[PDB]
Amino acid sequence: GSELSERIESFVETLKRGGGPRSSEEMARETLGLLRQIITDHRWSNAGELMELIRREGRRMTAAQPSETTVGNMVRRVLKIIREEYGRLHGSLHKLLEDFSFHYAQLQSNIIEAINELLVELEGTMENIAAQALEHIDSNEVIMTIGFSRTVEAFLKEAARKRKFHVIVAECAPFCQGHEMAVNLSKAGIETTVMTDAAIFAVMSRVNKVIIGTKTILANGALRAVTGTHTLALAAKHHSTPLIVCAPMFKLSPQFPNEEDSFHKFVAPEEVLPFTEGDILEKVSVHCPVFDYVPPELITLFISNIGGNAPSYIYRLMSELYHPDDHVL
Amino acid sequence: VPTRKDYGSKVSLFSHLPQYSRQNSLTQFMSIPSSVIHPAMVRLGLQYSQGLVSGSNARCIALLRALQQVIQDYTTPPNEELSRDLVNKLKPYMSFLTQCRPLSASMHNAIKFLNKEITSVGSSKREEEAKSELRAAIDRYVQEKIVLAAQAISRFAYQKISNGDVILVYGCSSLVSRILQEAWTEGRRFRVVVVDSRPWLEGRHTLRSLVHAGVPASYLLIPAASYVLPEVSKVLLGAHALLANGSVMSRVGTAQLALVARAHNVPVLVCCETYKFCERVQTDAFVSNELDDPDDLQCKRGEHVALANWQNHASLRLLNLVYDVTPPELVDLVITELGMIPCSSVPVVLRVK
Amino acid sequence: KELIEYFKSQMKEDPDMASAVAAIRTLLEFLKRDKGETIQGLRANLTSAIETLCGVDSSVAVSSGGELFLRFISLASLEYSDYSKCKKIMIERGELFLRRISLSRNKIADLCHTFIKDGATILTHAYSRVVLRVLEAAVAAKKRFSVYVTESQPDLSGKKMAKALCHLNVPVTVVLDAAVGYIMEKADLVIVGAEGVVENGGIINKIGTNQMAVCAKAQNKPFYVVAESFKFVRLFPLNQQDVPDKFKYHPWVDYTAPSLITLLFTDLGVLTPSAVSDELIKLYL
């Protein structure tokens, strides 16, 4: 039915125009619901046609907004699910020393069942990540964060009921989103503090631990985080302080820092330099990058829903999550 | 069985970890013929509290032998399955053993394997057969993960030790001692440097074992390690546990030794078994560690003890750490029965088991 | 004999081709000669041939290829423990393995040429077919860049690399072996070939590679490495002395730690210094 088409067009337009779901969990849920819907009301018989249809639609959605990789992750996850279910019904160096044109009957029902299982796991990821707060936080500890992330907020406020610590929050210069996080934390009695990015290194001598949130995790264990996290990681590495990253599994993309320049999302310079300056706006060149790149060497641990792990094992999670043929999409 | 009361004033940074005293034992408030606790477990807890069995594998072996004795002495009650009865009956014994002394990673892994095996027993099989199968599984596990794994690690480390080398060891680890003794018996001609630290002073065990074996050995304390490393060629260390992030959890004087070794450009090696590979993670020794008896810090220097009465000063604290954690950036190689693997391959081996 | 002659013949029809691939081809071709129907006779005759071949050519790649062939025969032995259909199935699998290893170079180039940006300066040490293919694919992708090659004093192969690069209409420049630190600041990334990948992730390359990696680490310069899968060797050198002397022989090779390597471009995909250990563990070679 054309209702699926109307929904797909609305989703692509809302992603390309402005931001859609505010939380990453809602974004992943909306993407998975749209994928399940595309699978449910559509004419497909064999796995190759369904996979190509999903690939074209996912390619469109990714071209709509390349920095929104949570949707590419969900598309690749659905593709991997389809491949696994098809291999279950149809039948490296160690390995080294395939058509999808057979049409079954119960393939759609089990694909939908797998998608629902993935949805429930997506829902439980938040508590699964927040449950590991006491294993890394201690009493009379100092924690530093940047920006506003729901995962880090839960991780911090889940341990305040049994531990007492001091939280330092560094705002983001273009979009001062750390103020909301600081207010939400102070509402729970955590003794929070707000500060600028210019005083990151100046205050990072009394800090004991750092917990932050990322937008996506690259293949070699590096991140695409908000602007200012590269400097935070540099200061942590200079003072040899562990930097924890609380990110669910859907924030993991199967790509290495191949690309160039289109990594960061550039928005209007109105936030950096207002339009009411004068005539100097014709000469002055202003750039406003929203995100930045954080190498893996400056990261210490990754707290996920399946337990903490080191960055040197993220490649295995990639091999476990996505299929090598669906990396380009 | 009542709670194990604490002893003395703990440190501000380690206020969440238990601090006990070896003179006050928990077996004081129990019946002489132990009724609620198994006699074997009572004797094991007493030995752990008194410090008679001090070692990762000695503790694991003693725990497994006590569990074999308990299973031999335990008869299942009626109107209930054995697969859950044994686990529910062993839970308080583990609680008591933890109250006597915090358990190590080896003991945790062994208890997890034993609980899995007990739960795997079917409700139809008989009792004697199930007990015999559990005892045999325990013995085969000991044989495969402790004795045969030690032989494989020694066989793999023999190629790394060469003639004229100067190896530096720390503390007391049976795996390192066996490796060195086998390398010396195989024809290698080297000399070892034993580093010790207070208050346990357990390095003297390896020192005397090597002297009895015939290996030229040296002895010195850990603060002077920066003085002996320039002449050291290799640093062999023992590990009690390997976390999922590659960090090494071992005796307290290992991370500092590895740090000083890297500064002096000396390749560091780590020997550990696959059953000591913990799946949890930790970044430093503050959130989870073990605080032993603080009275071990007292020393007879001169004719009087400066810390004879430390509890009178309400401002004075006594910190006695046991374990510590090392980052993967200070470990060069890890030796296991699977083969020589880097430290950033710890999760991969955890994958295969 | 015939092993020496066949190795030299395969090395001579095409110079381009590496020594390890030629050795694997010779081993599989000599596998057709085998008359014995016992598995230790096949094993020992072939192992003798691999050692003789390694004696003729002192290189880590030949030994790596030989170790891989014996491990593949051991897997094909764990097939059934037959040596009745085993030789046949093994020959087919070996032919498939050879055709697959042939495309390794193209796969590495198509996967590594994307990390080169327009207007960037590249720094290479010695001549290598893999880096040459990567650069040819990058210039084939409508890209423009500058390259700096070290003369490689032991044997003047850097000049050969510069000639082969200037032939592709690229502004190549030859620098002195002692000038690797002077031009390190004028380089955006470093891409070099690896003769053999050690167990931990390091690389065994020309004598003038470890110092370049050290300078790259001292200036936060991306140090990329390109190598095939048949160059994975189960070695673990702790320093410059732990490397076997048969590979060094003024040594001709050195070891580079994985902490100084940024990424690895192999036919199996783009990998990090630690993923190779996982691969080696999976093969149990």
UniProtKB/Swiss-Prot annotation, chain A:
Cysteine pairings via disulfide bonds: none
UniProt effect for mutating S149F: In VWM2; with ovarian failure
Record keywords, A-Z: Cytoplasm, Disease variant, Initiation factor, Leukodystrophy, Protein biosynthesis
Keyword Transferase: no
UniProt cross-references to InterPro entries, sorted A to Z: eIF2B_beta_subunit, IF-2B-related, IF_2B-like_C, NagB/RpiA_transferase-like
Coiled coil: none
Result of changing E191G: In VWM2; with and without ovarian failure
GO molecular function: ATP binding; GTP binding; guanyl-nucleotide exchange factor activity; translation initiation factor activity
Compartments it resides in: Cytoplasm, Cytosol
Keyword Iron applies: no
A cellular component term, taken from the record's GO annotations: eukaryotic translation initiation factor 2B complex
Any one of the GO BP annotations: translational initiation
Activity regulation (UniProt): Activated by the chemical integrated stress response (ISR) inhibitor ISRIB which stimulates guanine nucleotide exchange factor activity for both phosphorylated and unphosphorylated eIF2.
Domain of life of the source: Eukaryota
UniProt family annotation: Belongs to the eIF-2B alpha/beta/delta subunits family.
Job description of the protein: Acts as a component of the translation initiation factor 2B (eIF2B) complex, which catalyzes the exchange of GDP for GTP on eukaryotic initiation factor 2 (eIF2) gamma subunit. Its guanine nucleotide exchange factor activity is repressed when bound to eIF2 complex phosphorylated on the alpha subunit, thereby limiting the amount of methionyl-initiator methionine tRNA available to the ribosome and consequently global translation is repressed.
Description of how the protein assembles with itself and partners: Component of the translation initiation factor 2B (eIF2B) complex which is a heterodecamer of two sets of five different subunits: alpha, beta, gamma, delta and epsilon. Subunits alpha, beta and delta comprise a regulatory subcomplex and subunits epsilon and gamma comprise a catalytic subcomplex. Within the complex, the hexameric regulatory complex resides at the center, with the two heterodimeric catalytic subcomplexes bound on opposite sides.
Protein name: Translation initiation factor eIF2B subunit beta
Curated annotation (Swiss-Prot), chain B:
Keywords: Acetylation, Cytoplasm, Disease variant, Initiation factor, Leukodystrophy, Phosphoprotein, Protein biosynthesis
Region (May bind the chemical integrated stress response (ISR) inhibitor ISRIB): 4-13
Origin: domain of life: Eukaryota
A single MF term (Gene Ontology): translation initiation factor binding
Regulation of its activity: Activated by the chemical integrated stress response (ISR) inhibitor ISRIB which stimulates guanine nucleotide exchange factor activity for both phosphorylated and unphosphorylated eIF2.
Subcellular location: Cytoplasm, Cytosol
One GO BP: regulation of translation
Entry keyword annotation includes Cytoplasm: yes
Primary location: cytoplasm
This protein's GO CC annotations: cytoplasm; cytosol; eukaryotic translation initiation factor 2B complex
Subunit structure: Component of the translation initiation factor 2B (eIF2B) complex which is a heterodecamer of two sets of five different subunits: alpha, beta, gamma, delta and epsilon. Subunits alpha, beta and delta comprise a regulatory subcomplex and subunits epsilon and gamma comprise a catalytic subcomplex. Within the complex, the hexameric regulatory complex resides at the center, with the two heterodimeric catalytic subcomplexes bound on opposite sides.
Annotated function: Acts as a component of the translation initiation factor 2B (eIF2B) complex, which catalyzes the exchange of GDP for GTP on eukaryotic initiation factor 2 (eIF2) gamma subunit. Its guanine nucleotide exchange factor activity is repressed when bound to eIF2 complex phosphorylated on the alpha subunit, thereby limiting the amount of methionyl-initiator methionine tRNA available to the ribosome and consequently global translation is repressed.
Family listed: Belongs to the eIF-2B alpha/beta/delta subunits family.
Protein name from the UniProt record: Translation initiation factor eIF2B subunit delta
From Swiss-Prot, chain C:
Major localization class: cytoplasm
Residues recorded as bearing N6-acetyllysine in the entry: K32
Name assigned to this protein: Translation initiation factor eIF2B subunit alpha
GO MF annotations, alphabetized: guanyl-nucleotide exchange factor activity; identical protein binding; translation initiation factor activity
InterPro entries on file: eIF2B_alpha/beta/delta, elF-2B_alpha_N, IF-2B-related, IF_2B-like_C, NagB/RpiA_transferase-like
Disease: Leukoencephalopathy with vanishing white matter 1: An autosomal recessive brain disease characterized by neurological features including progressive cerebellar ataxia, spasticity, and cognitive deficits. Brain imaging shows abnormal white matter that vanishes over time and is replaced by cerebrospinal fluid. Disease severity ranges from fatal infantile forms to adult forms without neurological deterioration. The disease is progressive with, in most individuals, additional episodes of rapid deterioration following febrile infections or minor head trauma.
Gene symbol of the encoding locus: EIF2B1
Function: Acts as a component of the translation initiation factor 2B (eIF2B) complex, which catalyzes the exchange of GDP for GTP on eukaryotic initiation factor 2 (eIF2) gamma subunit. Its guanine nucleotide exchange factor activity is repressed when bound to eIF2 complex phosphorylated on the alpha subunit, thereby limiting the amount of methionyl-initiator methionine tRNA available to the ribosome and consequently global translation is repressed.
Gene Ontology cellular-component terms listed: cytoplasm; cytosol; eukaryotic translation initiation factor 2B complex; membrane; plasma membrane
Location of the protein in the cell: Cytoplasm, Cytosol
UniProt cross-references to Pfam families, sorted A to Z: IF-2B
Any one biological process term the GO annotation gives: response to peptide hormone
Keyword entries, A-Z: Acetylation, Cytoplasm, Disease variant, Initiation factor, Leukodystrophy, Protein biosynthesis
Similarity comment: family membership: Belongs to the eIF-2B alpha/beta/delta subunits family.
